């Protein structure tokens, strides 16, 4: 897990030897793994590249971070408001700093991860201090231009 | 982080003995080729340096132990218990004020989510 | 050292942290009497520590009056500051962050969820200062005092209710003589009552209460504290009456009243002070004595069981595929494996690799179908010897001929050549 780098944000043009060919300049990528879905039978955008040394994986994570690969925000990492279609290049501290401009955050946010890879699932949950920050996130942040990924902010629970 | 904290404590001790706002022992040190990034207010350590300077100024008070001796806080446990009870009452009043502010914010959010947003009038 | 600047601010921060801990202890609600007594003892210990810190900080003002002339001088300044900065310009290779400058006194004055006790008060216990019969200040133990009174009176006609009725009197006639041996038991009963009063309220000022009791004993009890309408003025030491105040003032400095008797003011002053302290403890803790008397009456009126309850509170595949034949491996915790297809595969599985790492021998194809420990270590010794032999080791295998003689001595190894060329 230390020598392997988890890549997120892969489109349909990216393939299993294509990621190994793109990561060959960063370091000696020994193997590439792409988990296939059960309903569609294709990649879900997240994969893994197992290299030989941890320094090559660190250089690939520091070089290929927030890159625009196949029209997709590909990024390598070390393997009541709901935000969907978020970029995997952002972290919890980056999401807390991005959410601090609209309103005040009550605590540190959390992002959902896949049970197989564990880098990024695609959705996240963040809680605001009051309902005014949630309304400002649903008015402004729900549709704002993020890092090559159109996010969507919505309410997790609402009572009619 | 011990050397930076010691430098901040030395700057707070040297700045508290000044007779003016700008005529201090640290303003002339900035022009004497001494790098001090904690003097600018843009850094996060400046908020702690200001609290250290405030504590150094409060350590120079006449009831702080320079020319007088405290008798109520040092020789009366009942006065300390009354001060602790007053601090607990002030904390309870602050918690009640925060709960009232949260209730007012919830009432404003309930009133804003129930008003009609289709009756537009441009005058 | 900045004793007037840094040490005074540190003492003020410690006093503020102690006051914040006391306010957090007083703001929290209580549910039990023993936990409340432990919190009161911790608050009293924190108040004593804050008073000691304030007394230590209040004495650091002798050199401050001499150093204030040099500290407030605007002619000085950045010279000594630059000298201190050059003294603080040492090697910064100690890459270690210390966030416990103010967080450590905040954590020392706090408690945990498993045990509600502070870090200086971690060794404090309520069972070392109070007995089980007292109930952490709920009642008072009077069985030993009643046994001592029955041993001193030499009679079995005094029960616990009679002793409680005799001990309830404050200014009435005593049960025995004042010059008898009952004063030695009364002094012990007063010394126990003083400790019971000091244990029932640790947050109260015991020294101020003792000084007030001494002032009331000296200024009031020694000057006729019980006026009448021999009955006009009574003396506690001499145990005699007086006609008027002038006769009592003339007899207060008399020769039998000073030292010419066995109950004078010279020898029987401590017994009178102990009796006054016992009367003050009975007047201040009368509700606890009434609760102890009610508990004794409820224990006497109860039965044996009530007193005990109060004191206690395809079978064919089975053999075709290889099952029913089990194999065990010592390298794997004597884990017994099933039919051969699984047993042969186990050497590659996780558990066997774990078991082999215990000895320090890698998992390879050589160590397959080997289940015993000593066999594994012997085969590892063999393989080690073989491989280490068949490698090319230049250090011991090489022929150098140093230029020391330059025409002789070709038996030099690769290490002696460096030693000769050094
Ligand atoms: Zn085994």
Author numbering:
A (entry chain 4): 11 to 89, 101 to 181
B (entry chain A): 160 to 282
C (entry chain C): 1 to 229, 279 to 362, 393 to 501
Published text:
Among the five snRNPs, the U2 snRNP plays essential roles during the recognition of the intron and assembly of prespliceosome. The 17S U2 is regarded as the functional form of human U2 snRNP that directly participates in early spliceosome assembly. Three RNA helicases – DDX42, DDX46 and DHX15 – are found to be associated with human U2 snRNP, but their roles and mechanisms in U2 snRNP and spliceosome assembly are insufficiently understood. Here we report the cryo-electron microscopy (cryo-EM) structures of the DDX42-SF3b complex and a putative assembly precursor of 17S U2 snRNP that contains DDX42 (DDX42-U2 complex).
The final sample contains U2 only of the five snRNAs, DDX42 and protein subunits of U2 snRNP (DDX42-U2 complex). After 2D and 3D classifications, 430,443 particles yielded a final reconstruction of human DDX42-U2 complex at an average resolution of 2.7 Å. Compared to 17S U2, the conformations of SF3b, SF3a and the U2 snRNA in the DDX42-U2 complex are nearly identical. The most significant difference is the presence of DDX42, rather than DDX46, in the DDX42-U2 complex. Our DDX42-U2 complex likely represents an intermediate state in which DDX42 has fulfilled its function but is yet to be released. Compared to DDX42-SF3b complex, the N-terminal sequences of DDX42, including the N-plug and helices α−3/α−2/α−1, remain bound to SF3B1, but the helicase domain has been displaced from the C-terminus of SF3B1HEAT. In addition, splicing factor TAT-SF1 and BSL of the U2 snRNA are recruited to SF3B1HEAT, anchoring on 15–18 and 18–20 HEAT repeats, respectively. Structural overlay of DDX42-SF3b with DDX42-U2 reveals overlapping positions between the helicase domain of DDX42 and BSL of the U2 snRNA. In addition, the helicase domain of DDX42 also overlaps with the Linker domain of TAT-SF1, which contributes to maintaining the BSL conformation.
